[PDB]
Design a protein around this ligand. Structure first.
Ligand SMILES: *[C@@H]1O[C@H](CO)[C@@H](O[C@@H]2O[C@H](CO)[C@@H](O[C@@H]3O[C@H](CO)[C@@H](O)[C@H](O[C@H]4O[C@H](CO)[C@@H](O)[C@H](O)[C@@H]4O[C@H]4O[C@H](CO)[C@@H](O)[C@H](O)[C@@H]4O)[C@@H]3O)[C@H](O)[C@H]2NC(C)=O)[C@H](O)[C@H]1NC(C)=O
Length: 534
């Protein structure tokens, strides 16, 4: 007899699944949490879902949000994609389990909640929650005015957190013990939820894996320039912002999503998108965010709940791993370094054009010693990209939360290299380039063909899940009993305490005065964070 739950909008029938270690759990997939954002509701904030008649089939995951998938080089999914997936080993309203919510990555351009299998997590007494939010121009169009204020896809997320608060009890989750977690755009997304009034009081604690809302690729400074370009590529007449959004509302969703890749200086190898979170205009009704993330954070405006944030030793394998796919790509980066530095390091909009030559030469000086880009300099290219894109702003996230929150704030550096890496998928080889962006996450979740059953990988899976469970219950994150105590970041210290996770059996407390080599990246004159003005 298949598992059944009533939620606010009606009755769900799910499936019975098995955890990694042979335990039964209830799985409810393809649960709608919002009206389909279709027709006049393309680009608009999520609308309330009208209750459904009869029993809704929650046995299968439903379509991912319509997206440019750069790995498959196609448009895939559907406009009808606002689906949540809820997994419980205790299907009982009185179970009151910690709730682990996961916001997927994909640079706000691609991905899906349904790619992340919760088999490992279901060997613990938590409810796991994955979900879809609108992506690319569908999720993040902005004309910088009431026509398209921006952040639709973050409003989808907030709406999903609101849905979890109102409905997770029926799956045996404690709404008052939600652990909000995410990776890449999802980690940035967790940080965005700390900053927004919309998500205040809707999570007890956070984990931002390899992502912060302070990172340039997570934030659009010139949305109206992006919207006009998209509209022009698609043959929409330029005139009023009203006419622009109206023409985009009536073009096929597939034409609007696919067109983004044809924009001028579109991210090299399509690993990021200009359709990202932005600052919504002043006086926007129920805005997600009306001020630049750094100014909200430094005013102490982040929600006062604990935080784990984290990076891997070779973060830059996103995107640098895709550079190994074609053997011509490193030679192309060498030949065109001066034009493409502002691209791959994502300061297209936050540095004057006349300053690009200068900054390009400083980056090549600092990390490559001015050597040509090649297989020999690949590791330094990876460190450079990982520092700029992920590690620096993860360090600022940890420090600024530790500084303002009055709450335990933890940092980890993951340097365990297991059987498999995300580099395998992105490079299409089995070469070891170190520990990629998301190689820790691929131990918590099963991602298609990036799951291992080696003894050492299985132990890391247990350790990282013990980190989430211990953080969600006691509040003191602990991977193993033998590990030295994980110390929080000291409020107001120039020094950042982090757990260095070399392996499941080897981790110790370390310290950086210059996390991600911030002193270098802060000195290049990017109009970001400490240097931001209107
Ligand atoms: C990265 O940063 C760089 C540096 O700022 C950005 O580069 C700017 O890119 C924009 C285009 O996105 C470009 O703007 C064009 O400038 C020209 C000035 O000579 C204009 O001719 C051109 O106008 C057309 O396009 C507009 C929309 O982009 C329309 O609103 C306008 O009506 C024009 O439309 C005509 O032409 C189109 C085809 O182009 C046609 O289909 C229409 O029907 C119509 O006939 C733009 O305004 C800037 O010049 C660039 N600046 C520099 C210095 O290079 C870049 O956009 C950023 N990229 C990302 C991804 O963020």
């Amino acid at each position: 007899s298949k598992p059944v739950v009533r939620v606010t909008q009606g009755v769900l029938q799910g499936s019975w699944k098995v955890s990694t270690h042979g335990r039964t759990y209830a799985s409810f997939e393809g649960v709608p949490y919002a009206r389909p954002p279709v027709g006049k509701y393309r680009f608009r904030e999520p609308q309330h879902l009208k209750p459904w008649a009869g029993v809704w089939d929650a046995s299968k995951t439903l379509p991912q949000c319509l997206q440019w998938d750069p790995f498959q080089q196609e448009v895939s999914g559907s406009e009808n994609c606002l689906y949540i997936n809820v997994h419980t080993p205790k299907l009982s309203a009185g179970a009151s389990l910690p709730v682990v919510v996961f916001i997927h990555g994909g640079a706000f351009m691609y991905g899906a909640g349904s790619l992340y299998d919760v088999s490992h997590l279901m060997d613990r007494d938590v409810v796991a929650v994955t979900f879809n939010y609108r992506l690319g121009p569908l999720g993040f169009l902005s004309t910088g005015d009431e026509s398209a204020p921006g952040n639709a896809g973050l409003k989808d997320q907030a709406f999903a957190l609101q849905w979890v608060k109102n409905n997770v009890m029926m799956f045996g989750g404690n709404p008052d013990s939600v652990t909000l977690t995410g990776c890449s755009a999802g980690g940035a997304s967790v940080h965005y939820h700390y900053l927004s009034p919309l998500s205040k009081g809707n999570f007890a604690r956070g984990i931002a894996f390899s992502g912060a809302a302070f990172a340039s690729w997570t934030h659009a400074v010139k949305p109206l320039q992006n919207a006009r370009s998209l509209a022009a590529i698609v043959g929409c007449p330029t005139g009023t912002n009203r006419e622009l959004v109206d023409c985009l509302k009536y073009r096929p969703a597939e034409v609007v999503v696919g067109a983004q890749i044809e924009m001028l200086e579109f991210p090299y190898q399509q690993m990021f998108t200009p359709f990202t979170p932005t600052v919504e205009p002043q006086g926007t009704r129920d805005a997600f965010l009306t001020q630049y993330p750094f100014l909200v954070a430094q005013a102490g405006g982040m929600h006062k709940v604990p935080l784990i944030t984290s990076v891997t030793s070779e973060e830059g394998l996103y995107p640098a791993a895709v550079y190994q796919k074609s053997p011509d790509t490193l030679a192309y980066l060498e030949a065109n370094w001066d034009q493409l530095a502002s691209n791959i390091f994502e300061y297209n909009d936050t540095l004057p054009v006349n300053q690009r030559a200068g900054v390009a030469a400083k980056i090549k000086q600092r990390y490559l010693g001015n050597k040509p880009v090649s297989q020999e300099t690949y590791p330094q290219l990876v460190q450079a990209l990982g520092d700029r894109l992920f590690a620096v702003d993860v360090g600022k996230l940890a420090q600024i939360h530790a500084r303002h929150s009055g709450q335990p704030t933890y940092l980890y550096r993951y340097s365990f290299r297991g059987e498999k890496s995300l580099s395998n998928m992105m490079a299409s080889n089995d070469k070891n380039y170190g520990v990629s962006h998301a190689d820790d996450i691929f131990h918590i979740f099963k991602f298609p063909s990036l799951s291992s059953t080696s003894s050492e990988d299985v132990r890391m899976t247990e350790a990282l899940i013990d980190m989430i469970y211990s953080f969600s219950t006691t509040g003191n994150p602990k991977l193993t009993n033998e590990a030295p105590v994980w110390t929080p970041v000291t409020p107001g210290s120039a020094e950042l305490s982090y757990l260095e996770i070399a392996s499941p059996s080897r981790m110790e407390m370390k310290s950086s005065s210059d996390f991600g080599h911030r002193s270098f990246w802060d000195s290049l004159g990017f109009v970001e964070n400490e240097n931001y003005r209107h």
